[PDB]
């Protein structure tokens, strides 16, 4: 490949000390730059820009200009959009030129010439008196009638999840173990091998912020948006190639807040585990551009897990940033569900059998036995309820399971009340009414249970 | 003006989530955001000396920045803070004219000895967050309140505590070494979920009591005695459930 960088050139005429590399300037000059003999090379760039309702002001930064250079810019709307104002300022905000509306009043143009040793310019386009405009800019190109701007550095990102290690249903947070990777290109980080005799330079056990502060160069630092407390990190390394290609690697264990949890439909609920990585720099410096899948996003492990992942996705977006501008965001989302067989077999079948015991006793015609069995079955129900109390999260609000337990307990107690009434009726000599009540209860109870189940399904799952 | 004047500070606070309440030690934990803004000509700089329009400090407290630049700044603390405070996105940035602002995302635990649980579960409580300046009132004073977001944010799903109303106010309190310091207070009025307690406790209790009431219609007193004895055991079982 070729190479890039700055250089120092020493030329001598009949001065044998030059080949030592230490020749100090002397005598009268004899050579000059060749490019000065011809017209300077022009650079031209065109951009399409749009001023949304909340984004009526736009600014762009230019590359450095050498003394004697010239700058030209013009703006022409795509359609019937009104002509915006155009102006040019340096990096401090000092005005240098203002746009002039042409006599065929469809465009605005600007011109400037460089006096200082180094000039850094900013182009302002504003319509704050879906409009879309065409912006044309050139250096040493007066023929604009018939890259100049700086470009953001592109970052590649990737993330993999190894294990979900905990979920807190009262404080609404979860913890995850995984791996993160970043990669970008920066010519300012390049070095010359002959000064170190090596091809790879590395930094270990340091955050990107610390390395950036040590080498005094801007780097794409990041943070987890919903991080709770400190983060544990292993195998943290940064290494750079002579061309300037850099990469970051980290293995992390972190706890993330998740206020989006909703446990109303427990245990039939479905949840989302979202992991957000945000750059700590403005979008005009660094931006996420590509997604790399270095491993499986969701890793398989031996044995069963409490949460089963159904699907996942990865996406890049932009979010508002402090001190204006914008910062990039990388999001990983996992869709998870619980193990249904566990809850069904552990809770619902025994509950059904307990309910059946209280239902079947109405076939008896000896009401004392019916009363005694109902009284015993209520105690059995309460004992089973606290036995399963361990799988009953205390959240401060009702779930589906709590409502079902309450309804079942109420019906079980009403059975005892009806049994007492039937016993009294049989004692007074009205056995026919007791038999009619038995038939009514035997018909009605399963209908009530089925109707309650239908109502719950309608009100919670559709 | 002949006499020196205090610098005017604008403050704002937002609550994102209440993450826990301790009823025995009487404290609670909250997640939110804090913002400060003030103007000081001594912080001004010349753009041509940096080639920039904004100067920033990151991951540092106001006290540390004040000690680094050797100028007085409006430091602050949480009055009832328990233990260390977790902070994210901490930044201070200044404009050439001298306008400065502070930003912080925090998670903190605050003591609350004012809790009163006598009327449980029908009790109502106040969650109060107090921010005090660590400087005398003749140097810095809170002047205005900024509502940069909703004061109490909405979250998907139900919460254990329901916020009924809120308020924000600025006052003055006595300070060490005399004088006075400013205080900014945010108060949330909260209550519990009543349907949960009513349906989970009172209806089953009513049915259990009715079982012991109905048995007096019987004229076979052995059956009445046996059913009463069983119902007492059922009552104890439900109580420990
Ligand atoms: Ca929630
Ligand atoms: Ca108290």
PDB file of N, CA, C and O in Angstrom, chain A residues 97-145:
ATOM      1  N   UNK A  97     -18.469  37.317   6.058  1.00  0.00           N
ATOM      2  CA  UNK A  97     -19.172  37.665   4.832  1.00  0.00           C
ATOM      3  C   UNK A  97     -20.655  37.385   5.012  1.00  0.00           C
ATOM      4  O   UNK A  97     -21.060  36.610   5.883  1.00  0.00           O
ATOM      5  N   UNK A  98     -21.467  38.027   4.175  1.00  0.00           N
ATOM      6  CA  UNK A  98     -22.915  37.875   4.211  1.00  0.00           C
ATOM      7  C   UNK A  98     -23.437  37.642   2.801  1.00  0.00           C
ATOM      8  O   UNK A  98     -22.854  38.127   1.826  1.00  0.00           O
ATOM      9  N   UNK A  99     -24.532  36.893   2.698  1.00  0.00           N
ATOM     10  CA  UNK A  99     -25.035  36.497   1.393  1.00  0.00           C
ATOM     11  C   UNK A  99     -25.795  37.617   0.703  1.00  0.00           C
ATOM     12  O   UNK A  99     -26.511  38.396   1.334  1.00  0.00           O
ATOM     13  N   UNK A 100     -25.640  37.688  -0.616  1.00  0.00           N
ATOM     14  CA  UNK A 100     -26.303  38.685  -1.445  1.00  0.00           C
ATOM     15  C   UNK A 100     -27.326  38.004  -2.342  1.00  0.00           C
ATOM     16  O   UNK A 100     -27.010  37.017  -3.013  1.00  0.00           O
ATOM     17  N   UNK A 101     -28.550  38.532  -2.351  1.00  0.00           N
ATOM     18  CA  UNK A 101     -29.592  37.995  -3.218  1.00  0.00           C
ATOM     19  C   UNK A 101     -29.375  38.504  -4.638  1.00  0.00           C
ATOM     20  O   UNK A 101     -29.217  39.711  -4.864  1.00  0.00           O
ATOM     21  N   UNK A 102     -29.365  37.586  -5.601  1.00  0.00           N
ATOM     22  CA  UNK A 102     -29.119  37.952  -6.989  1.00  0.00           C
ATOM     23  C   UNK A 102     -30.319  38.689  -7.583  1.00  0.00           C
ATOM     24  O   UNK A 102     -31.447  38.598  -7.092  1.00  0.00           O
ATOM     25  N   UNK A 103     -30.053  39.443  -8.653  1.00  0.00           N
ATOM     26  CA  UNK A 103     -31.123  40.175  -9.330  1.00  0.00           C
ATOM     27  C   UNK A 103     -32.211  39.250  -9.863  1.00  0.00           C
ATOM     28  O   UNK A 103     -33.399  39.564  -9.677  1.00  0.00           O
ATOM     29  N   UNK A 104     -31.902  38.122 -10.522  1.00  0.00           N
ATOM     30  CA  UNK A 104     -32.935  37.096 -10.715  1.00  0.00           C
ATOM     31  C   UNK A 104     -33.163  36.347  -9.415  1.00  0.00           C
ATOM     32  O   UNK A 104     -32.583  35.278  -9.200  1.00  0.00           O
ATOM     33  N   UNK A 105     -34.017  36.893  -8.551  1.00  0.00           N
ATOM     34  CA  UNK A 105     -34.001  36.541  -7.145  1.00  0.00           C
ATOM     35  C   UNK A 105     -34.441  35.126  -6.840  1.00  0.00           C
ATOM     36  O   UNK A 105     -35.512  34.899  -6.270  1.00  0.00           O
ATOM     37  N   UNK A 106     -33.605  34.166  -7.236  1.00  0.00           N
ATOM     38  CA  UNK A 106     -33.835  32.761  -6.932  1.00  0.00           C
ATOM     39  C   UNK A 106     -32.684  32.098  -6.189  1.00  0.00           C
ATOM     40  O   UNK A 106     -32.790  30.905  -5.886  1.00  0.00           O
ATOM     41  N   UNK A 107     -31.597  32.808  -5.887  1.00  0.00           N
ATOM     42  CA  UNK A 107     -30.459  32.217  -5.198  1.00  0.00           C
ATOM     43  C   UNK A 107     -29.721  33.291  -4.411  1.00  0.00           C
ATOM     44  O   UNK A 107     -29.878  34.489  -4.657  1.00  0.00           O
ATOM     45  N   UNK A 108     -28.910  32.841  -3.453  1.00  0.00           N
ATOM     46  CA  UNK A 108     -28.072  33.707  -2.632  1.00  0.00           C
ATOM     47  C   UNK A 108     -26.636  33.210  -2.727  1.00  0.00           C
ATOM     48  O   UNK A 108     -26.391  31.999  -2.711  1.00  0.00           O
ATOM     49  N   UNK A 109     -25.687  34.140  -2.821  1.00  0.00           N
ATOM     50  CA  UNK A 109     -24.288  33.796  -3.036  1.00  0.00           C
ATOM     51  C   UNK A 109     -23.408  34.570  -2.063  1.00  0.00           C
ATOM     52  O   UNK A 109     -23.803  35.602  -1.520  1.00  0.00           O
ATOM     53  N   UNK A 110     -22.197  34.051  -1.854  1.00  0.00           N
ATOM     54  CA  UNK A 110     -21.266  34.591  -0.874  1.00  0.00           C
ATOM     55  C   UNK A 110     -19.844  34.391  -1.381  1.00  0.00           C
ATOM     56  O   UNK A 110     -19.573  33.469  -2.153  1.00  0.00           O
ATOM     57  N   UNK A 111     -18.935  35.263  -0.942  1.00  0.00           N
ATOM     58  CA  UNK A 111     -17.545  35.217  -1.377  1.00  0.00           C
ATOM     59  C   UNK A 111     -16.634  35.703  -0.259  1.00  0.00           C
ATOM     60  O   UNK A 111     -17.012  36.579   0.523  1.00  0.00           O
ATOM     61  N   UNK A 112     -15.433  35.132  -0.190  1.00  0.00           N
ATOM     62  CA  UNK A 112     -14.463  35.506   0.830  1.00  0.00           C
ATOM     63  C   UNK A 112     -13.061  35.170   0.339  1.00  0.00           C
ATOM     64  O   UNK A 112     -12.880  34.344  -0.558  1.00  0.00           O
ATOM     65  N   UNK A 113     -12.068  35.830   0.935  1.00  0.00           N
ATOM     66  CA  UNK A 113     -10.664  35.596   0.628  1.00  0.00           C
ATOM     67  C   UNK A 113      -9.868  35.537   1.925  1.00  0.00           C
ATOM     68  O   UNK A 113     -10.162  36.266   2.877  1.00  0.00           O
ATOM     69  N   UNK A 114      -8.859  34.670   1.955  1.00  0.00           N
ATOM     70  CA  UNK A 114      -8.173  34.308   3.190  1.00  0.00           C
ATOM     71  C   UNK A 114      -6.978  35.223   3.429  1.00  0.00           C
ATOM     72  O   UNK A 114      -6.121  35.378   2.553  1.00  0.00           O
ATOM     73  N   UNK A 115      -6.929  35.831   4.615  1.00  0.00           N
ATOM     74  CA  UNK A 115      -5.821  36.699   4.995  1.00  0.00           C
ATOM     75  C   UNK A 115      -4.899  36.081   6.038  1.00  0.00           C
ATOM     76  O   UNK A 115      -3.681  36.285   5.973  1.00  0.00           O
ATOM     77  N   UNK A 116      -5.442  35.338   6.998  1.00  0.00           N
ATOM     78  CA  UNK A 116      -4.642  34.807   8.089  1.00  0.00           C
ATOM     79  C   UNK A 116      -3.839  33.590   7.635  1.00  0.00           C
ATOM     80  O   UNK A 116      -4.041  33.044   6.548  1.00  0.00           O
ATOM     81  N   UNK A 117      -2.906  33.170   8.494  1.00  0.00           N
ATOM     82  CA  UNK A 117      -2.098  31.995   8.190  1.00  0.00           C
ATOM     83  C   UNK A 117      -2.945  30.732   8.112  1.00  0.00           C
ATOM     84  O   UNK A 117      -2.741  29.905   7.216  1.00  0.00           O
ATOM     85  N   UNK A 118      -3.893  30.562   9.029  1.00  0.00           N
ATOM     86  CA  UNK A 118      -4.836  29.451   8.987  1.00  0.00           C
ATOM     87  C   UNK A 118      -6.234  29.994   9.247  1.00  0.00           C
ATOM     88  O   UNK A 118      -6.466  30.689  10.242  1.00  0.00           O
ATOM     89  N   UNK A 119      -7.162  29.684   8.348  1.00  0.00           N
ATOM     90  CA  UNK A 119      -8.550  30.106   8.474  1.00  0.00           C
ATOM     91  C   UNK A 119      -9.452  28.885   8.580  1.00  0.00           C
ATOM     92  O   UNK A 119      -9.410  27.999   7.721  1.00  0.00           O
ATOM     93  N   UNK A 120     -10.267  28.849   9.630  1.00  0.00           N
ATOM     94  CA  UNK A 120     -11.272  27.812   9.832  1.00  0.00           C
ATOM     95  C   UNK A 120     -12.636  28.481   9.745  1.00  0.00           C
ATOM     96  O   UNK A 120     -12.923  29.412  10.503  1.00  0.00           O
ATOM     97  N   UNK A 121     -13.476  28.011   8.827  1.00  0.00           N
ATOM     98  CA  UNK A 121     -14.709  28.698   8.486  1.00  0.00           C
ATOM     99  C   UNK A 121     -15.922  27.846   8.834  1.00  0.00           C
ATOM    100  O   UNK A 121     -15.856  26.614   8.843  1.00  0.00           O
ATOM    101  N   UNK A 122     -17.030  28.523   9.129  1.00  0.00           N
ATOM    102  CA  UNK A 122     -18.309  27.884   9.413  1.00  0.00           C
ATOM    103  C   UNK A 122     -19.371  28.543   8.548  1.00  0.00           C
ATOM    104  O   UNK A 122     -19.482  29.774   8.525  1.00  0.00           O
ATOM    105  N   UNK A 123     -20.148  27.730   7.839  1.00  0.00           N
ATOM    106  CA  UNK A 123     -21.212  28.209   6.966  1.00  0.00           C
ATOM    107  C   UNK A 123     -22.536  28.087   7.705  1.00  0.00           C
ATOM    108  O   UNK A 123     -22.884  27.008   8.198  1.00  0.00           O
ATOM    109  N   UNK A 124     -23.275  29.190   7.783  1.00  0.00           N
ATOM    110  CA  UNK A 124     -24.573  29.230   8.441  1.00  0.00           C
ATOM    111  C   UNK A 124     -25.667  29.346   7.392  1.00  0.00           C
ATOM    112  O   UNK A 124     -25.613  30.228   6.528  1.00  0.00           O
ATOM    113  N   UNK A 125     -26.659  28.466   7.475  1.00  0.00           N
ATOM    114  CA  UNK A 125     -27.866  28.560   6.666  1.00  0.00           C
ATOM    115  C   UNK A 125     -29.059  28.469   7.604  1.00  0.00           C
ATOM    116  O   UNK A 125     -29.203  27.485   8.338  1.00  0.00           O
ATOM    117  N   UNK A 126     -29.907  29.494   7.588  1.00  0.00           N
ATOM    118  CA  UNK A 126     -31.022  29.554   8.516  1.00  0.00           C
ATOM    119  C   UNK A 126     -32.255  30.092   7.809  1.00  0.00           C
ATOM    120  O   UNK A 126     -32.163  30.956   6.935  1.00  0.00           O
ATOM    121  N   UNK A 127     -33.412  29.570   8.206  1.00  0.00           N
ATOM    122  CA  UNK A 127     -34.681  30.051   7.703  1.00  0.00           C
ATOM    123  C   UNK A 127     -35.612  30.477   8.817  1.00  0.00           C
ATOM    124  O   UNK A 127     -36.836  30.390   8.680  1.00  0.00           O
ATOM    125  N   UNK A 128     -35.046  30.939   9.927  1.00  0.00           N
ATOM    126  CA  UNK A 128     -35.837  31.356  11.084  1.00  0.00           C
ATOM    127  C   UNK A 128     -36.203  32.834  10.999  1.00  0.00           C
ATOM    128  O   UNK A 128     -35.904  33.634  11.885  1.00  0.00           O
ATOM    129  N   UNK A 129     -36.844  33.209   9.890  1.00  0.00           N
ATOM    130  CA  UNK A 129     -37.323  34.578   9.735  1.00  0.00           C
ATOM    131  C   UNK A 129     -38.414  34.894  10.751  1.00  0.00           C
ATOM    132  O   UNK A 129     -38.404  35.956  11.383  1.00  0.00           O
ATOM    133  N   UNK A 130     -41.556  20.975   5.223  1.00  0.00           N
ATOM    134  CA  UNK A 130     -40.433  20.192   4.722  1.00  0.00           C
ATOM    135  C   UNK A 130     -39.657  20.909   3.624  1.00  0.00           C
ATOM    136  O   UNK A 130     -39.351  20.308   2.589  1.00  0.00           O
ATOM    137  N   UNK A 131     -39.346  22.187   3.828  1.00  0.00           N
ATOM    138  CA  UNK A 131     -38.558  22.931   2.853  1.00  0.00           C
ATOM    139  C   UNK A 131     -37.183  22.297   2.676  1.00  0.00           C
ATOM    140  O   UNK A 131     -36.531  21.907   3.648  1.00  0.00           O
ATOM    141  N   UNK A 132     -36.741  22.203   1.426  1.00  0.00           N
ATOM    142  CA  UNK A 132     -35.490  21.530   1.093  1.00  0.00           C
ATOM    143  C   UNK A 132     -34.728  22.392   0.098  1.00  0.00           C
ATOM    144  O   UNK A 132     -35.312  22.948  -0.836  1.00  0.00           O
ATOM    145  N   UNK A 133     -33.415  22.505   0.306  1.00  0.00           N
ATOM    146  CA  UNK A 133     -32.574  23.406  -0.467  1.00  0.00           C
ATOM    147  C   UNK A 133     -31.331  22.671  -0.944  1.00  0.00           C
ATOM    148  O   UNK A 133     -30.924  21.658  -0.370  1.00  0.00           O
ATOM    149  N   UNK A 134     -30.734  23.197  -2.009  1.00  0.00           N
ATOM    150  CA  UNK A 134     -29.464  22.704  -2.526  1.00  0.00           C
ATOM    151  C   UNK A 134     -28.358  23.689  -2.179  1.00  0.00           C
ATOM    152  O   UNK A 134     -28.465  24.882  -2.481  1.00  0.00           O
ATOM    153  N   UNK A 135     -27.299  23.189  -1.552  1.00  0.00           N
ATOM    154  CA  UNK A 135     -26.152  23.999  -1.161  1.00  0.00           C
ATOM    155  C   UNK A 135     -24.943  23.568  -1.978  1.00  0.00           C
ATOM    156  O   UNK A 135     -24.600  22.382  -2.005  1.00  0.00           O
ATOM    157  N   UNK A 136     -24.305  24.527  -2.639  1.00  0.00           N
ATOM    158  CA  UNK A 136     -23.112  24.282  -3.437  1.00  0.00           C
ATOM    159  C   UNK A 136     -21.966  25.103  -2.866  1.00  0.00           C
ATOM    160  O   UNK A 136     -22.134  26.292  -2.578  1.00  0.00           O
ATOM    161  N   UNK A 137     -20.806  24.469  -2.703  1.00  0.00           N
ATOM    162  CA  UNK A 137     -19.657  25.090  -2.058  1.00  0.00           C
ATOM    163  C   UNK A 137     -18.395  24.714  -2.823  1.00  0.00           C
ATOM    164  O   UNK A 137     -18.276  23.605  -3.352  1.00  0.00           O
ATOM    165  N   UNK A 138     -17.448  25.647  -2.880  1.00  0.00           N
ATOM    166  CA  UNK A 138     -16.207  25.399  -3.588  1.00  0.00           C
ATOM    167  C   UNK A 138     -15.054  26.199  -3.030  1.00  0.00           C
ATOM    168  O   UNK A 138     -15.233  27.284  -2.469  1.00  0.00           O
ATOM    169  N   UNK A 139     -13.857  25.641  -3.193  1.00  0.00           N
ATOM    170  CA  UNK A 139     -12.606  26.297  -2.831  1.00  0.00           C
ATOM    171  C   UNK A 139     -11.798  26.506  -4.104  1.00  0.00           C
ATOM    172  O   UNK A 139     -11.576  25.557  -4.866  1.00  0.00           O
ATOM    173  N   UNK A 140     -11.361  27.748  -4.330  1.00  0.00           N
ATOM    174  CA  UNK A 140     -10.631  28.127  -5.543  1.00  0.00           C
ATOM    175  C   UNK A 140     -11.424  27.773  -6.798  1.00  0.00           C
ATOM    176  O   UNK A 140     -10.865  27.379  -7.823  1.00  0.00           O
ATOM    177  N   UNK A 141     -12.744  27.926  -6.720  1.00  0.00           N
ATOM    178  CA  UNK A 141     -13.639  27.589  -7.824  1.00  0.00           C
ATOM    179  C   UNK A 141     -14.651  28.708  -8.009  1.00  0.00           C
ATOM    180  O   UNK A 141     -15.781  28.633  -7.512  1.00  0.00           O
ATOM    181  N   UNK A 142     -14.277  29.771  -8.726  1.00  0.00           N
ATOM    182  CA  UNK A 142     -15.236  30.854  -8.991  1.00  0.00           C
ATOM    183  C   UNK A 142     -16.326  30.480  -9.981  1.00  0.00           C
ATOM    184  O   UNK A 142     -17.271  31.260 -10.152  1.00  0.00           O
ATOM    185  N   UNK A 143     -16.233  29.320 -10.630  1.00  0.00           N
ATOM    186  CA  UNK A 143     -17.188  28.900 -11.644  1.00  0.00           C
ATOM    187  C   UNK A 143     -18.336  28.072 -11.075  1.00  0.00           C
ATOM    188  O   UNK A 143     -18.911  27.252 -11.801  1.00  0.00           O
ATOM    189  N   UNK A 144     -18.679  28.256  -9.797  1.00  0.00           N
ATOM    190  CA  UNK A 144     -19.764  27.483  -9.200  1.00  0.00           C
ATOM    191  C   UNK A 144     -21.106  27.746  -9.869  1.00  0.00           C
ATOM    192  O   UNK A 144     -22.013  26.914  -9.755  1.00  0.00           O
ATOM    193  N   UNK A 145     -21.263  28.884 -10.552  1.00  0.00           N
ATOM    194  CA  UNK A 145     -22.509  29.145 -11.267  1.00  0.00           C
ATOM    195  C   UNK A 145     -22.757  28.089 -12.336  1.00  0.00           C
ATOM    196  O   UNK A 145     -23.867  27.556 -12.449  1.00  0.00           O
TER     197      UNK A 145
END
